[PDB]
Ligand binder design. Structure first.
Ligand code: NAG
Ligand code: NAG
Ligand code: NAG
Ligand code: NAG
Ligand code: NAG
Ligand code: NAG
Ligand code: CA
Ligand code: CA
Lengths: 412, 192, 412, 192
């Protein structure tokens, strides 16, 4: 049953499942070892001394290959897979991971997990519009001012909740394998308990894309063994969070174009449920609140209008409830709701105002009538001085016709 | 039709009835049935019949030339054709009516009076300010109408059940164009 | 049944069928190819380049011959025939087509249709009297002022509706084959909606002959291929319109002389129905009007006159109805209508005034009568003083004759 | 379960009910029974599910995450595992309640009145200064109680032996948290 509506029939706020958005997806990487088969060296500590182990990275052989697929595959500790940058990727070399989500997700966290020692310098950026422009999410360094030009550990106020912080956290060369980096986009933001009511934070969390750049490795010499030991290895990459449906969907699916969109059930529309779906323009679109779900309401045209438009003046005028107005009413009816018959017509009354033929032709006599308009219901026409009837075709008792079309009836 | 060796000879008749923005045309096949007729090429235009050309069915006796100008002298040509080719054309010319005629849509007659003559008869008269087929209708004042046409401004209704009030209306027709029902006059026939 | 009279017996205006007057007729041409068999070159455009095709014009061979017959024959698109002028007929060469209709036609339009590219310079003239003198109908050129000395596109006022206009219309070298020229004699004349009531326009339209002169071709070089490509070709020539019968005939036919004349049924006469037919001279001839057909009326002679003549004074005097007077009344009757017996005669009365012998001899006595004239009906004569009787041959009671022929009777 | 060749597919459901300092979580096995499930790895923490990891029995459908912070957004992940290794996780997130909720322990309703309507009926009403499940109970004034729940601030007791004084009490429940029995009101039913 729909989680978007309650125990009986009422709209209630709905949120998609929290997922790791990275799980399926392919991630582009600046470099990967094995291209020509190369050598790497992983260092171990048994007791107090450093013990080097050497191994072959080979992209054609499946045991020795470390493709970026291995960034997002199923993460099995028992059997483990790592993507691996080549050797001597040290500063000022970058290694960049870049990932499209193809949809606006609200991201709660970003996780990397390293088969290698953690990098000493890394940066996490998001794209908020499908890859065109990036903003920083988080910065990790031992020297923040030096590397990223960011004073480290800036206190975050209400007036910057979107500021990218640089910090020394999770930079330790230990663990030398299996180490973690987990960015929490809501960590230490001031209004983060108010996220439902804070647009800036809701905005802060939204991303279509995630880019990770490794900047500096850890030292632990210039020899070739030393160089072959310097590289990046990540076993798993995760972007955790939800699909951004504005509280107006519990799911996201593919559409005709194989794009991912919210499956919007509020009478909502567009990929984020940012707007009302057509002929629902009675009230202006709202994001869903815990207290008040706000679904677009269908405006009433009584079957005589196939189109609709919102009017702010009307809204504000009508007590801040409704609303919209119907556009061009067919079947000889006149707006707002096409709730009556156009001037020049009258009511059938043997049908209600909704019916196709509920608008009956109001036929007034070209001569006998002073105008072309019926009384809406009674059927009357504006008869001239001495005329009478429904249409005005006959002179009243005591009267007879004249040769004058202007003054058709006279007394006697 | 026996043989297609040669083109069709000319159509036997052509007649054209101009409307204001339109022209109606009618015709008949050649008199000699023995030469296969596969259809007709109508052609038309202002001052010459070259502005446009229409092709039609062999069984077509009729055509309406449908988008045209007021007060314009059109010339029309008609050819019959078959595989051999097209034969000699027949022509006629017509001048479409003026938008004046459709500008003011026709209005009913005014100053209508019905005076009872007898038990079976009532005299109806009207007026007109235009200086022409008038259609009079009558009915009991449920029961339905009776129609009559006149060329004049007064008619005399006969065959009426005595001591019964009737209802009389008139319309008018000009250059095949008609107004609506004029206001009604009520007269009661005489006791016989 | 006659279209010249209505549903019952009354004269109504009648108009001959609209025809292409050129269809039968032979048209004289200044030049035609093939005379000695010659060569022509027709140029084609496939895509963007010009492709020459050459062909033989041969007047003896029927496939290759292009006689002027082919100007007026049956016009079959499927099988097409063109008259063709010879090559290097370019300026200042003329090629002239000339055509007699042998009758006064009211021409509505003149059509030429070209197997060749349209000419850049052409002129249409009419003869209004059987070939003697020409006036211009229309002029086509790119340079009107240069070629024909006519300022192009002169606006036509009421005070020149007969002015020949030069214009650039239908001068395009495209189409290179099958192109048209259609002159409409009523086009842009001011009073052309009033043609029924405008004599100048009715006059403007009348022609016994049509002459077309081709003046300049289109350039498209001096080589012989170039020269052999320069010529005129017309597939069909048409003069559309009606036979001019003055509204007094629906047909034109041949007469004893094999001339074409209107088959005049209004009591009209002459080749155009311009006059009344003999002994119809009661009223003066009129052209037929949509509102009033005007047929010559027979004047009443009561069988006593074989000839008739119109009198304007009488017409104007008699209330502008009638009319004419009978000429020399035989059978002793006296005009206007021979409606009585000449002075010197009297009425039979046993016959009506129409009968041969309705004029009876009025015999007065050489002596007894004071004069030679009867009373018209009674039979009386102008008896002298003492005489009596019908003729006066006897002296009245109380009287007797004398020796005096002057005074024949005396009292006693 | 037929075979352990591959890791378990994902759990079918996950649901979480946050307490103030605690969080309750429930789930269900994968839909495919054929792959042996040897237990689950729960993992959890603030903003990411990495702060802690618990391992449990294959037959476990339930877990209580028991030492946690007020007003904190926790993310929870759940994996099924076996000898092959661990399969793909399911997640959910929850925000623990505030210590405000346990600070002032819930207090009964006040201003309670019971007025006898009839021989079989008594109307009970109360008030609240908080600006919600109220539980009313009644008994004879030895003999024991009768309970009823309401969503409103007034209830109407039915089925009462006439001319008998009863005793009515109310408590209240907020966000699954309950006060004690409000002061009692004594009303005697009508003689029938
Ligand atoms: C890399 O792996 C492929 C595939 O097994 C193997 O054929 C190739 O020899 C390997 N390269 C080296 C340098 O051993
Ligand atoms: C298990 O790990 C290997 C090597 O690390 C990797 O090639 C592969 O993805 C996994 N094998 C299976 C069963 O897919
Ligand atoms: C690469 O390294 C530079 C250091 O100068 C850094 O500023 C930049 O963001 C990194 N990423 C890319 C994509 O260049
Ligand atoms: C022209 O045609 C005639 C008749 O067919 C033919 O005899 C003659 O040879 C032709 N002329 C030329 C130059 O071919
Ligand atoms: C058809 O066309 C040819 C050549 O163009 C011409 O000689 C002739 O007039 C036509 N043939 C017939 C069937 O008359
Ligand atoms: C021939 O060409 C001249 C150009 O000077 C033109 O004026 C004339 O009307 C044309 N026709 C005749 C028959 O000469
Ligand atoms: Ca992996
Ligand atoms: Ca021809």
């Amino acid at each position: 049953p729909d989680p978007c509506y309650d125990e009986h029939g009422l709209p209630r706020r709905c949120i998609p499942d929290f997922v790791n958005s990275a799980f399926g997806k392919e991630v582009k990487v600046s470099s990967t070892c094995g291209k020509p088969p190369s050598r790497y060296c992983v260092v171990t500590e048994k007791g107090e001394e450093q013990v080097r182990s050497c191994h072959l990275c080979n992209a054609s052989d499946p045991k020795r290959a470390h493709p970026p697929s291995f960034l997002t595959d199923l993460n099995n500790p028992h059997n483990l897979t790592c993507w691996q940058s080549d050797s001597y990727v040290q500063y000022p070399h970058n290694v960049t991971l870049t990932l499209s989500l193809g949809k606006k997700f609200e991201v709660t966290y970003v996780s990397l997990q390293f088969c290698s020692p953690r990098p000493e310098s890394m940066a996490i950026y998001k794209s908020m519009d499908y890859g065109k422009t990036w903003v920083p999410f988080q910065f990790y360094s031992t020297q923040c001012r030096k590397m990223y030009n960011k004073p480290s550990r800036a206190a975050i106020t209400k007036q910057n909740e979107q500021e990218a912080i640089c910090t020394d956290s999770h930079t330790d060369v230990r663990p030398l394998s299996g180490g973690l980096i987990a960015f929490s986009t809501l960590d230490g933001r001031p209004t983060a308990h108010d996220f439902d009511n804070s647009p800036v934070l809701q905005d802060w969390v939204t991303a279509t894309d995630i880019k990770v750049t490794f900047s500096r490795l850890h030292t632990f010499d210039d020899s070739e063994l030393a160089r072959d030991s310097y590289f990046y290895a990540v076993s798993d990459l995760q972007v955790g969070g939800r699909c951004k449906c504005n509280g107006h969907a519990s799911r996201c699916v593919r559409d005709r174009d194989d794009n991912l969109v919210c499956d919007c059930k509020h009478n909502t529309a567009g990929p984020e449920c940012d707007r009302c779906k057509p002929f629902h323009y009675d009230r202006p679109w709202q994001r869903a609140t815990a207290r008040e779900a706000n679904e677009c309401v269908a405006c009433n045209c009584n079957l005589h209008a196939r189109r609709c438009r919102f009017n702010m003046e009307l809204y504000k005028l009508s007590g801040r409830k409704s609303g919209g107005v119907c556009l061009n009413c067919r079947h000889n009816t006149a707006g707002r709701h096409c709730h009556y018959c156009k001037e020049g017509f009258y009511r059938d009354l043997s049908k209600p105002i909704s019916h196709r033929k509920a608008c009956k032709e109001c036929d007034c006599h070209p001569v006998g009538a002073a105008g072309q308009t019926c009384n809406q219901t009674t059927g009357q026409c504006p008869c001239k001085d001495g005329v009478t009837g429904i249409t005005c075709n006959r002179c009243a008792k005591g009267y007879q016709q004249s040769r004058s079309p202007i003054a058709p009836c006279i007394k006697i | 039709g026996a043989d297609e060796s040669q083109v069709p000879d000319q159509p036997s008749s052509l007649h054209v009835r101009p409307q204001t923005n339109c022209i109606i045309m009618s015709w008949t096949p050649p008199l000699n049935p023995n030469i296969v007729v596969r259809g007709y090429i109508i052609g038309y235009g202002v001052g010459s019949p070259y502005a446009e050309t229409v092709r039609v069915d062999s069984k077509q006796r009729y055509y309406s030339i449908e988008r045209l100008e007021s007060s314009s002298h059109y010339v029309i040509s008609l050819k019959a054709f078959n595989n051999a080719g097209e034969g000699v054309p027949l022509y006629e010319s017509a001048t479409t009516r003026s938008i004046t005629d459709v500008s003011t849509p026709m209005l009913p007659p005014v100053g209508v009076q019905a005076v009872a003559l007898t038990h079976e008869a009532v005299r109806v008269s009207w007026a007109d300010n235009s200086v022409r087929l008038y259609t009079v209708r009558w009915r009991t004042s449920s029961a339905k109408y009776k129609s009559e046409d006149t060329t004049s401004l007064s008619y005399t209704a006969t065959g009426l059940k005595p001591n019964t009030m009737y209802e009389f209306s008139v319309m008018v027709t000009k250059n095949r164009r008609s107004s609506t029902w004029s206001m009604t006059a009520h007269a009661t026939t005489y006791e016989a």
